Amino acid sequence: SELDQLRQEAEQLKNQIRDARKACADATLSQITNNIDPVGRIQMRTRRTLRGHLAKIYAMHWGTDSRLLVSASQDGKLIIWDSYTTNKVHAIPLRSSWVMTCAYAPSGNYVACGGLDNICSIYNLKTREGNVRVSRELAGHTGYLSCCRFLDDNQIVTSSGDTTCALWDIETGQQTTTFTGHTGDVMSLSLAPDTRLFVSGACDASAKLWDVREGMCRQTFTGHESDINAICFFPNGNAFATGSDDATCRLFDLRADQELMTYSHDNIICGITSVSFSKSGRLLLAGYDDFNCNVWDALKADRAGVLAGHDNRVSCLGVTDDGMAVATGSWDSFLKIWNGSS
Template sequence: MCDQTFLVNVFGSCDKCFKQRALRPVFKKSQQLSYCSLCAEIMATDGLHENETLASLKSEAESLKGKLEEERAKLHDVELHQVAERVEALGQFVMKTRRTLKGHGNKVLCMDWCKDKRRIVSSSQDGKVIVWDSFTTNKEHAVTMPCTWVMACAYAPSGCAIACGGLDNKCSVYPLTFDKNENMAAKKKSVAMHTNYLSACSFTNSDMQILTASGDGTCALWDVESGQLLQSFHGHGADVLCLDLAPSETGNTFVSGGCDKKAMVWDMRSGQCVQAFETHESDINSVRYYPSGDAFASGSDDATCRLYDLRADREVAIYSKESIIFGASSVDFSLSGRLLFAGYNDYTINVWDVLKGSRVSILFGHENRVSTLRVSPDGTAFCSGSWDHTLRVWA
């Protein structure tokens, strides 16, 4: 089998042809070499054992995948909704728009809550990143990015910084201050550099490290202060669209989803994929851990949301209806984990009973597709962003 792993590109002299080109660090039998793309491809071909071809390796992988599914099926003895039959049904569920945040000049693409349960950061196709006071709807900070389509933004755990990025292929970190006259752009740090657009970012449990996902098919862990790449995660076969960090104190795992229809769980220490699930029929737009960290939900363009139990190593529930024909763009759990909020491309937000698999409410208000959705840290409200240029706080 191939024993090479490719990481991020750098520029320098190729160790094989000695030409000045963009390089890929190649690890072969624990030895690190720097090869250009052409030499790396030749190396990968030479690394195949005798009588092995790409077709035979793919066939072997499919065979192993089939055996894995057979073992999972043996343990699939009961459905989640059957276990939850004796659980009391949820009563009347009513949520309304309490605040509408207006200020973006184009589609809202991403948002995140501050740990103080009050402030929100949002990013938009207009190239603006805005920090809001969700109580008063006032704008506290605004940053104009050097590109449009700012597809990712995140609040630092301390609440003293924000991260954002998009078509510039970078993740930039801006410190937040109370001095209104201070130029935030002057203190910007360019932390991460991918070879394609930045699709998602999330701080770890401190302000010092940040996870990023990209259209180059990789995820990466970076040191915020130095901008150094700490770990890269390779395994997706197409654009990575979303990620979420496990809600544990150590925070050593995260889940990602992408255009290859796969949801993958990663160990941040080793850089290895420890679990993979491929049951969706289209792109996975959003992933979110269950509050306990033992499961996660995903939302996809196949118009379904799905729940995966990490201990059972399988999908345990599908949230869908025949009347729902548009893709799910964003998902998040209530603080208790009983409810799953899902934003859809048909302008609605559906609320699902996680245990029983039934829809308990539909929320209307947005005038275009719902692109992002997050529950507040204290669970008392959630915020949604839309292509109608607005954000709404629901409670």
């Protein structure tokens, strides 16, 4: 009786939200951006190839100086690369080799990683002893660690396969905030440029926008037909793009609270592993299972170019903070640095 009545009210609320979104859908992003000229063909060459990982690479993250990056592989090694020279700055042996994510702190003093061990380990890069040591192991998730992002040297947000995201206090080792509401494994998260909000994509084919300070879900974005594997904020923080197993990328707007554009091609039938934006946001770079990375025109939904330089699944990619280069990591155990030429 009471349960039946309540679940009927949820359907009414869902219809109310759907009608509200349809009311403000006066135009389409495609119609708005019809007049603008296309970006043309985007040609990027492999400037650097980072060799040394001996297993599949699952994650990489640029440092804020746009020169150092950290990559994680399931050979149990965290490696910090000097992308300009391809020199290895550090090689961090991981206690658990089943790492799925890695993050570089914006200060450059810390890196984080974690995988099937359900632990987010924080590593101190600046020690008087001259070696990288574990400073914290963040326990509390009951599923595998899928993504992590630093807010500062003391705060980090992690997403897990236990359907929850958590905000951690690194100094005390306790999760100050727990973000619940996903019904599937959360696979990725992206921080807003001001680090006051973050979006997460889960295996329930939905993307939720979370308030870091308040700790509740502000908006929920649906439209994908399969698990969301990747998510990335637009450079202004007012939009984000997702990548799913249905071979599509979608651009959602926070303020319009609905999907604006879909990035798919008929030839593409494989899942998407990673997504990122260029510095201006005009380019959306997505990594795919078909061993390639496709550069999309974000505004016009045109495939601007292809990065085809890997012999296995492109598992991760990232664009530098200055926008100078994009790195792609792959299951073939190599990282490559790409940029165009005049």
